[PDB]
Tab-separated table of C-alpha atoms in Angstrom:
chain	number	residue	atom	x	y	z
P	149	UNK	CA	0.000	0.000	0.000
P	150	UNK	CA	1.598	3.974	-0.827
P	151	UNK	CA	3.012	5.468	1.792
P	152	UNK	CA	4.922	2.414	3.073
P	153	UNK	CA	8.699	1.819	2.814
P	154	UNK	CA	9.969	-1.099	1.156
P	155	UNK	CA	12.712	-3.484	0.904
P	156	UNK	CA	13.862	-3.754	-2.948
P	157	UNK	CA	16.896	-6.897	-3.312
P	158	UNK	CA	20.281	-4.906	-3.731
P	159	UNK	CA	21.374	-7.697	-6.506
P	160	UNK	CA	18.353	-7.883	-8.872
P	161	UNK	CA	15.615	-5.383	-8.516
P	162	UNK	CA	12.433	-6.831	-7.350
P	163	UNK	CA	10.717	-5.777	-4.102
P	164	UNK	CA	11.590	-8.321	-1.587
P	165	UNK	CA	10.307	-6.474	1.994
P	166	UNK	CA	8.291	-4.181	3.888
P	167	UNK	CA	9.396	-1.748	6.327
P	168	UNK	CA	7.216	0.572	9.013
P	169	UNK	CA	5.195	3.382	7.823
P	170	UNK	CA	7.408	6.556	8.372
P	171	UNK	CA	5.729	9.666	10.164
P	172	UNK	CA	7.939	12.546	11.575
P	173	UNK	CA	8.143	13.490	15.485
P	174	UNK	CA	8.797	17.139	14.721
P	175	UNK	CA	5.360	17.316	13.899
P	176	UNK	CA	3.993	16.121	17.191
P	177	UNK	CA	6.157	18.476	19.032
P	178	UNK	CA	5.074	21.308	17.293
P	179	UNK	CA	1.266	20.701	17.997
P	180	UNK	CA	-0.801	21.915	20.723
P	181	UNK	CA	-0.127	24.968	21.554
P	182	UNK	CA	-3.594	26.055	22.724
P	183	UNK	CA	-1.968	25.638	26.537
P	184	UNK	CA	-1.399	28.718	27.691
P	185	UNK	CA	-4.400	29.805	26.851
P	186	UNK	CA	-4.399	33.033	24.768
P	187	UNK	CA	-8.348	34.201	24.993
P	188	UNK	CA	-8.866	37.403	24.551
P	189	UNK	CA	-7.635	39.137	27.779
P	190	UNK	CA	-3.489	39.007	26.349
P	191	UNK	CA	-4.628	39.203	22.536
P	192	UNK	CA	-6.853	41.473	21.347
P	193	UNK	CA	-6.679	45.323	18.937
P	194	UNK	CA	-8.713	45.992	15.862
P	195	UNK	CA	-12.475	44.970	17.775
P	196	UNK	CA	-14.175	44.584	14.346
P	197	UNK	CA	-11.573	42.223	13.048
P	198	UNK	CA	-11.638	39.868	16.176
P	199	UNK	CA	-15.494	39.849	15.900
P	200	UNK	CA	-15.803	38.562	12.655
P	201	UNK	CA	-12.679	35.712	12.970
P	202	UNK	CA	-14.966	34.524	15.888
P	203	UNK	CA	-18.290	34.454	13.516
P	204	UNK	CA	-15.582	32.467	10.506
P	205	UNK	CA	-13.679	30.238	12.802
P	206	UNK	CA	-14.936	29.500	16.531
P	207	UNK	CA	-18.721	29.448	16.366
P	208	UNK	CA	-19.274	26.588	13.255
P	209	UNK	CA	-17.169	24.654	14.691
P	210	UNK	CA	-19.335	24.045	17.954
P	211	UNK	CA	-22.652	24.774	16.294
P	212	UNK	CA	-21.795	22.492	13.191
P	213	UNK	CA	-25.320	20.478	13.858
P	214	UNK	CA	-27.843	23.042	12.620
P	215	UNK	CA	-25.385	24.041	9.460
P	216	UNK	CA	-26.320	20.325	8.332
P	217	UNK	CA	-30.026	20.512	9.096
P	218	UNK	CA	-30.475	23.872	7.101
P	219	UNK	CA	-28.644	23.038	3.891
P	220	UNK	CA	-26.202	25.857	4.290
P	221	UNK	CA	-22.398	25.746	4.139
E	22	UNK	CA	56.228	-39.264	3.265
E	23	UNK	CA	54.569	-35.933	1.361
E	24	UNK	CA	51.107	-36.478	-0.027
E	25	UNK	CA	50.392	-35.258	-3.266
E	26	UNK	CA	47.252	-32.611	-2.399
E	27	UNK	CA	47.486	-31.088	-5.806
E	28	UNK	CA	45.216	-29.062	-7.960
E	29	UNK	CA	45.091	-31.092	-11.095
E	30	UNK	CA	43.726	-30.033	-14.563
E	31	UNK	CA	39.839	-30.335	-14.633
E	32	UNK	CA	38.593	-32.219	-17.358
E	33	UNK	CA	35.304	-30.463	-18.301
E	34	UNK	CA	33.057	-32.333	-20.619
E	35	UNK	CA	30.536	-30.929	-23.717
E	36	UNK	CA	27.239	-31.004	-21.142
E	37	UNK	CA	28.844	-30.067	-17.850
E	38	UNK	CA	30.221	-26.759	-19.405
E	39	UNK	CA	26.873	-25.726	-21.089
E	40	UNK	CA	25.092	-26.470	-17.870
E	41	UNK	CA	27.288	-23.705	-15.886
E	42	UNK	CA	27.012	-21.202	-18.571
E	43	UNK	CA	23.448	-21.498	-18.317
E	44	UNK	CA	23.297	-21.692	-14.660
E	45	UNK	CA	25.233	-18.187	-14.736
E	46	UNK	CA	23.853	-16.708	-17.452
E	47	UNK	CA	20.154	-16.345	-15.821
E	48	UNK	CA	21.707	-16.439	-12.237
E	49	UNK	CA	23.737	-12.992	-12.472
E	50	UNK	CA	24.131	-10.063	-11.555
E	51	UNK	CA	22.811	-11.800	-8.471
E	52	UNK	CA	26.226	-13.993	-6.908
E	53	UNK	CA	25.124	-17.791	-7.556
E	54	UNK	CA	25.959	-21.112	-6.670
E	55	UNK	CA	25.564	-24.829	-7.075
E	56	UNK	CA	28.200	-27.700	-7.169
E	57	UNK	CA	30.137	-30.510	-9.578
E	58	UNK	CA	29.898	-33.721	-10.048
E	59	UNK	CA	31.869	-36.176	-11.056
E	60	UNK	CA	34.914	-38.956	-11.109
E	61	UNK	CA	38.330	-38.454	-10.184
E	62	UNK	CA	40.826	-41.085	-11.349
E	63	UNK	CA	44.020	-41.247	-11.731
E	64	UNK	CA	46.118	-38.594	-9.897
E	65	UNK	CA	46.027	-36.126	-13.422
E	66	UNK	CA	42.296	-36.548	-14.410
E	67	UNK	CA	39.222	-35.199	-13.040
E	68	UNK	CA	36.213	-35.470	-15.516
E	69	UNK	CA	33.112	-33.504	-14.182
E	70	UNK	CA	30.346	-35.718	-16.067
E	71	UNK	CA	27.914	-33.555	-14.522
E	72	UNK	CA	26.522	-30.589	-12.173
E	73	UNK	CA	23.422	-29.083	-10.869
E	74	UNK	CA	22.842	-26.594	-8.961
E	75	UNK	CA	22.141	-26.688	-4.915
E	76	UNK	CA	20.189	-23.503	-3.840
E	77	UNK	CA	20.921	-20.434	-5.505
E	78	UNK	CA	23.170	-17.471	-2.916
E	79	UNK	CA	21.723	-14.167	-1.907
E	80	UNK	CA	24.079	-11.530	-1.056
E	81	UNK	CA	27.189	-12.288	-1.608
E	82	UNK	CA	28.556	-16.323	-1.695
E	83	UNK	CA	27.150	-17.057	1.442
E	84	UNK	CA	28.439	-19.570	3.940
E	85	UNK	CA	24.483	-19.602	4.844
E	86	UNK	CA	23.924	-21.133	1.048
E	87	UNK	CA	26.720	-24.078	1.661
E	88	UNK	CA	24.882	-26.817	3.065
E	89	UNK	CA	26.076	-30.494	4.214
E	90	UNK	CA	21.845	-31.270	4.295
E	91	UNK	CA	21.120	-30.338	0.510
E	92	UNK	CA	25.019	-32.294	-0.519
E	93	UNK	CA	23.461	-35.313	1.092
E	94	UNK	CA	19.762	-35.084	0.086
E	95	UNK	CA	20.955	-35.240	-3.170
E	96	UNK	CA	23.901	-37.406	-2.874
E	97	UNK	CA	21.537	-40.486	-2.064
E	98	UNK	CA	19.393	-39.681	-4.795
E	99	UNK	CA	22.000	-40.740	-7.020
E	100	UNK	CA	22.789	-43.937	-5.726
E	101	UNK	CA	19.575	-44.850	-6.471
E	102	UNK	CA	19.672	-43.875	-10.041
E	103	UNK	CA	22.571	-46.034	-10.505
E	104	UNK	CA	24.823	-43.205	-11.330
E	105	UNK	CA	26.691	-42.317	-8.042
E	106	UNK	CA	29.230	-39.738	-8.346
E	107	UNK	CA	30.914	-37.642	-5.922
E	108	UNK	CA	30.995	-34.278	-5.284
E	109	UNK	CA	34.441	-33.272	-7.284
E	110	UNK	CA	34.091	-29.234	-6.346
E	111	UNK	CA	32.352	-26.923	-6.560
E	112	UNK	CA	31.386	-24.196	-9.311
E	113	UNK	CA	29.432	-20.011	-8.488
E	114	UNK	CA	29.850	-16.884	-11.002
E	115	UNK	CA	30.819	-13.396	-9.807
E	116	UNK	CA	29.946	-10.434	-12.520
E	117	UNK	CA	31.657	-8.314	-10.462
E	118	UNK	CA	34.910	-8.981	-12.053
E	119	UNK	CA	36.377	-11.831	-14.398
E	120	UNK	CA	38.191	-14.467	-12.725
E	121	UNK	CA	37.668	-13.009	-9.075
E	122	UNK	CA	36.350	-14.622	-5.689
E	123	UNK	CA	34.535	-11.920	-3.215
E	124	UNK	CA	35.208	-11.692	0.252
E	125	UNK	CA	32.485	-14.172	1.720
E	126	UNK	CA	33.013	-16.757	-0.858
E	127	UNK	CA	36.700	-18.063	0.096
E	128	UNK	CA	35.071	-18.932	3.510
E	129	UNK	CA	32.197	-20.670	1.776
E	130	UNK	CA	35.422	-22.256	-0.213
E	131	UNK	CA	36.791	-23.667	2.874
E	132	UNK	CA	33.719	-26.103	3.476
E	133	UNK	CA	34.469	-27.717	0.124
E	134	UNK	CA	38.281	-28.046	0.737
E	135	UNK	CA	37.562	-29.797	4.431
E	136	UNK	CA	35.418	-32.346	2.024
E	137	UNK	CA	37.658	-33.341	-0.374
E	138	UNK	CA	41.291	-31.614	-0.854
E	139	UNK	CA	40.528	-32.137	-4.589
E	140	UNK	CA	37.997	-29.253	-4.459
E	141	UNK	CA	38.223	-26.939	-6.700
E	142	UNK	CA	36.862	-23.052	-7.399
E	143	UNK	CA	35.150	-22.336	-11.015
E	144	UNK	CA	34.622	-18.459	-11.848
E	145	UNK	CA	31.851	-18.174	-14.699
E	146	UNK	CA	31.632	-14.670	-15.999
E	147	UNK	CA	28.575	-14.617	-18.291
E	148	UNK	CA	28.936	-10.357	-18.866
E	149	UNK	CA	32.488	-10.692	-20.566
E	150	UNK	CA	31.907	-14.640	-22.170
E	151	UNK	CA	31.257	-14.897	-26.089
E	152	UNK	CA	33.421	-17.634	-26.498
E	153	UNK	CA	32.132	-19.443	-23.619
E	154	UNK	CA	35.960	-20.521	-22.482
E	155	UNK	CA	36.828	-17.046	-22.206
């Protein structure tokens, strides 16, 4: 299956093993970094601009249900 | 009191030669094995009547691929044919370069020798062979 590694035979070339899937750690360090929080009480300027990033972003997310139900995207 | 222990000049009949340069000629690049048979008379004459090979080497000429329990599996065999030979040497091809043992293969060598001191080496290069002696 893609995205697995693979043995191929050094002497005639014909794929002879499997090997793990590789993934990266650096990846997993770099997520999460919702801890500290952030809010806004130590980000925040430009009131309109925050207001509407919380309509795009925050609020689907958690209301995602009724989006289905009404036939909107 | 000396022994004789000698490498003498290998008699190589029409069939026996034809059946290493086919045995080569498929089995490279990858390094390949199998042994000789036939009679050794005389203290001048070995005539290799026949060979086959016994399981084909991976990497290199493994002393993995030399096996005592594959020379005897089909060492009885024979006798029952009513042609029983022995095991004169043994024969392998290297494309790596003409005439040439590697590295693993003079230990996988040393098996044979310990058999019979009239063991003997055979380098088949099918890459640089159209004359089929050469």
């Amino acid at each position: 299956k893609p995205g697995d590694l693979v043995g191929v035979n050094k002497d005639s070339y014909l794929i002879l093993e499997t090997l793990p899937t590789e993934y990266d750690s650096r990846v997993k360090a770099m997520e999460v970094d919702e801890r500290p929080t952030e809010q806004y009480s130590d980000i925040g300027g430009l009131d309109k601009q925050i207001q509407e990033l919380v309509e795009a972003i925050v609020l689907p997310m958690n209301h995602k249900e009724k989006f289905e139900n009404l036939g909107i995207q | 009191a000396p022994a004789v222990d000698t490498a003498e000049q290998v008699y190589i009949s029409s069939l026996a030669l034809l059946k290493m340069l086919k045995h080569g000629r498929a089995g490279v690049p990858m390094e390949v094995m199998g042994l000789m048979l036939g009679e050794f008379v005389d203290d001048y004459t070995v005539r290799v009547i026949d060979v086959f090979a016994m399981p084909q080497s991976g990497t290199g000429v493994s002393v993995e691929a030399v096996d005592p329990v594959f020379q005897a599996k089909m060492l009885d065999m024979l006798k029952q044919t009513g042609r029983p030979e022995m095991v004169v040497g043994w024969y392998h091809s290297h494309p790596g370069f003409g005439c040439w043992l590697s590295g693993v293969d003079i230990n996988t060598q040393q098996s044979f020798e310990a058999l019979s001191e009239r063991a003997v080496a055979v380098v088949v290069d099918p890459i640089q062979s159209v004359k089929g002696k050469v």
